[PDB]
């Protein structure tokens, strides 16, 4: 019943906003400039066993999080192609450290703002095909397939 995830993405894309809505079902909109931030670690000891999740965005502890981790989420904002570009160094960083059989997921969060949609799902799906990983578009605000994401991550055993 142990279940450990790892969430990656640029600042502000909504890693903790997705994890916080999968663990506690809550969401509360906020804004704060990146100069003030992010990094969160939320792990609630269930009852049967455990459920531990981490969001990462000087010190290169990303190497430690990846080496110790065993299932990764890559989050980019639909309204930011730059944030999608920042995930490729993280993918290569998870490939050099580990092995292929790793369960990886590419998430297009903040899909509720198609008026600001910079990344069309075509460009992203091609990348998911070339990475041999799964891709889906979530929205922590409106709870669009947020549970359907972590469920698909829990299945991969
Ligand atoms: N409109 C909208 N805003 C979102 C969504 N997900 C996250 N946000 C906003 O993004 C802000 C910062 O996200 P955060 O999780 O702190 O960034 P991260 O921890 O670096 O991944 C939050 O205050 C949310 O209001 C979404 O699906 N839709």
């Amino acid at each position: 019943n142990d279940y450990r995830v790892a969430v990656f993405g640029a600042g502000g894309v909504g890693k903790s906003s997705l994890v916080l809505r999968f663990v506690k079902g809550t969401f509360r909109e906020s804004y704060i400039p990146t100069v003030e931030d992010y990094r969160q670690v939320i792990s609630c000891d269930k009852s049967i066993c455990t459920l531990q999740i981490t969001d990462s965005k000087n010190r290169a502890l990303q190497r430690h999080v990846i080496a110790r981790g065993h299932a990764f989420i890559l989050v980019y904002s639909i309204t930011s192609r730059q944030s999608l570009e920042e995930l490729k160094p993280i993918y290569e960083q998870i490939c050099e450290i580990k092995g292929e059989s790793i369960p990886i997921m590419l998430v297009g969060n903040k899909c509720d703002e198609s008026p600001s949609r910079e990344v069309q799902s075509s460009e992203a799906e091609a990348l998911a095909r070339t990475w041999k990983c799964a891709f889906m578009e979530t929205s922590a605000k409106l709870n669009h397939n947020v549970k359907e994401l972590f469920q698909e991550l829990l299945n991969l055993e």
Side-chain angles (χ1 to χ4, degrees), residues 9-17 27-31 55 109-113 138-142:
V13 301
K15 300 179 287 298
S16 62
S17 311
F27 183 90
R28 212 273 180 79
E29 192 156 23
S30 82
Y31 176 81
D55 323 288
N109 183 35
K110 305 176 117 171
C111 69
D112 53 313
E113 306 192 309
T138 69
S139 176
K141 197 182 186 305
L142 311 182

Side-chain angles (χ1 to χ4, degrees), residues 6 18 26 60 69 79 105 139:
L18 294 162
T26 76
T79 84
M105 194 99 62
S139 176

